[model samples]
Target: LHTQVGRGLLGAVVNPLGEVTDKFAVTDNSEILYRPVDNAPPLYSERAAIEKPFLTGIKVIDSLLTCGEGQRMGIFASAGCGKTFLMNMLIEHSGADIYVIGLIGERGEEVTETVDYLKNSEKKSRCVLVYATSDYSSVDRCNAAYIATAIAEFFRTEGHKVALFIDSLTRYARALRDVALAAGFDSLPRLLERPGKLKAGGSITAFYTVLLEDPLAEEVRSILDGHIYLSRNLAQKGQFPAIDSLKSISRVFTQVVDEKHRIMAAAFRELLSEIEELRTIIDFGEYKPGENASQDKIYNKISVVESFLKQDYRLGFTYEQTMELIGETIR
Candidate 1:
């Protein structure tokens, strides 16, 4: 596939028999769904009804960062903090009607590895992979996310709920900043703007990873319905997801989840914050087992919370099981 300034093309250059193609081929013209990148028709009116929640099958996220259908969510982390791994888990467990992923500015190896895995898995039929790596020009990388979103929107209107994952918006934004300068924009916009809104019974739930220091990252964070902050320290401690629960949030947390569970999730966050402070004192040997009855109780309780938060991808939980676990923790 090749794309120029005003032209975009998608077709195989090689045959299944591993031979070079003599003639270029394209999909059926009647099957093409055309829409503008900017200002596509509204899928919903000013007052679109909210549908059911989109269960991620991750206890922490489904319970805490309660994303419903049509929500725009994100996952933020520093490099190598398991962003790709967690995103892969989401794709496996998300249960969406369609999965559209954008590997914008990701390494070719990472793209190939994940794509191959999905291609072999049960998700191959429902998944659509779009990518632009470091090898591509800045413009291509910038357009990757949009192209992925376009694909999502295409399926979404046909009544399929789409889950879109952009591995790192940090790279996408940087490319856009360059594109902006090249196209002669005076000042880069603080907010990232998109033309269309999600609607119909379908949703546009996005999970994006962003570096900590990018200026555009902060703006993206502000716009998202919710986002999880990953921790390098936790990763070093062998935590797979390594999410910093204390810093993560979801605006629709209570609405999408059980009201009673919301209380427990919030309480869990508070306990995590307290545990961080407790660790400091314990590290300095000020508090140890049986040092003080109250201190011991708090520290011991921290262990319980840790066990609840710590989960393995292989041993996954159903929604009911997750709720029961949270209930046990809070009780």
Candidate 2:
């Protein structure tokens, strides 16, 4: 079915059935391929190491919660806490041959905004937006996730690097729960269990947004390569990405980064950890900057680093650029 849909879907918004949902019409050449949505992932022997960094162009993510090609990572956050914002930044700057975005049970306004945002992006020609808005039935929403995955797999099989973003997997889970309740019956590891970096040279790097409140959040976290935990407190403090430096982890960081990069990242996390301790002291009104030279130095370094992490939405920094700037700030 995807062969019939084919590469023509670039820049097109479609539903689960491969029918065009955007303003433009698409030609169907009648060609077909029998690709299954639930196709088994590449075997362990068919997989390679995730050594290349998937640069998101956001300082916090690129430097701290680094992602690799073919990695499966989650953006764990609550509603309206910059999950969509961070995802948008990734779609705009995360360089990949193709992008497949699945909007399952998202607000209608969000869907519209996402489509409009993609329309303006230079990468739109390499993208496909498969969405089921909040008004859709649970079955329709549930099917949307599979359709998006199939589209990404189709691109990956074509030897194109793919970045697949699924917004709010919690909603997708809820849809499954609803379907089971309706039928009187009881889900997400299977989707995330695939290994990163196929030996065949094609990859599908997936980023799933899981709500912090989801019952399966921990289960989902355990299956993925790692997670970027977006903190509400950080968001409240006006951090653009709101990525918690201490809470997030990229399991493949050591494999993907050099000794220098790894050391810098460790130092950055250490600074943030110290700042967290300072916050505890300030809560009791016992903090005084000059009272301890080391504490004062940590306070100053954290201010610089935090500001460095707050990135502008319109600007993107490459991996080298991010590392250079962070090195300067830390010194």
Candidate 3:
């Protein structure tokens, strides 16, 4: 039988054979619920409550959030924000406490300044530099961070507390992008809009968000003892420089500190919730594609959730209470 098929999906079905086809099994997906690790870090006030170390010989940022030895950490910030500066400050204040190895991704002169800064700066005389910023072959550039990190790990193995500074994870990611391009791999986390800036860690811009990958980010998280991620809040509005979204960035050093365990977790969890609420608001304002009035309901839902958060903030939640509240609010 032949028939006309048009807009009315089912009513206009035609042909000699047109029928519902395959049947798939209802496989159990519950096992994944117990996944040993989550792509997202744990969101609990408790983690932030840990006490932090008292850093001497450095400025507030370095001494406050210490990235210690055998640790990998990330510092993500929009250009012009002080990522490298903070790193330098840490190196300086660490006061030859740890052995720092510096790697310049695309900015060697900048690396030079750090080297000279450490040398001239009396407190940080113990730091070392691994220069890679000079105009170099792409292959060497691509593998520079891996090599640098390897070196750091080796040094640490030799009982040195090594802090390897890769100016940016963007460089290593860019090398991956280049190789991906050469190999015809199309499906990627696409971060190329932030032109003329190929970070070793992958990066790109879409609409307005600047995306990135920290090649060393994972390294910092798993291997290193104390770490820091310095990045600005691109989604931030208003005049004051965005607070280091200390939420997205993670460092484990706080745990070893005296009595800061619970308080630290709370400070971040509260901030994390606020950021989430903000994200929802922004998403509602920029909804697109296949989303209709039903999706728009998310707008209302998000608004209510935000209202609750606003009330909490207005009451001036204390550091301890806020940490407890983080768990309650999330649940």
- On TM-score, the leading prediction is 2
lDDT of 2 by residue, 210-324 (tens): 8875558977888888999988888898888788878889988887888999899888788778888988887889878789988788777777877888888878998889999
**lDDT by residue (tens digit), candidate 1, 136-243:** 777777667666666666666676777878767778777877788787822112222231234433566667778774666677777777788888899998766797
How do the predictions measure up, each by TM-score? 0.83, 0.92, 0.45
* Ordered list by lDDT, greatest first: 2, 1, 3
Q: Residue 289 lDDT in model 2? A: 72
**What's the lDDT for all of these models?**
0.65, 0.80, 0.37
lDDT of 2: 0.80
Question: Which stretches of model 1 miss by more than 4 angstroms?
Answer: 1-32, 41-51, 185-201
RMSD of every candidate to native, in Å, equals: 5.6, 2.6, 23.9
Regions more than 4 Å wrong, model 3: 1-69, 179-246, 249-254, 258-261, 264-331
lDDT of 1: 0.65
What local lDDT does model 1 show for residue 83? 81
Off by over 4 Å in 2: 1-5, 23-34, 182-187
By lDDT, the best candidate is 2
At residue 203, candidate 1 shows an lDDT of: 60
